[PDB]
Amino acid sequence: GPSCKHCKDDVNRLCRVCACHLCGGRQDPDKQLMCDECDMAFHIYCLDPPLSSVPSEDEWYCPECRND
């Protein structure tokens, strides 16, 4: 009864739904930011520009959801 029906929780598979939305990679979930609009996950280092730390502010919006 997998948590993610898309990848079936298969650690061998990339998944842009339950892992990094940009690269699909599963590593470093402690460095994957959650977007406060779409609730997808983004490695800090997959962003443009890449970030070296988790932002301090409570609310963060991914490139797909943020104001331009």
Binding site: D30, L33, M34, D36, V54, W60
Partner: peptide, 9 residues
């Protein structure tokens, strides 16, 4: 901001 998970220091 929120992260997907946390990790031990």
């Amino acid at each position: 901001a929120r992260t997907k998970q946390t990790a031990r220091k």
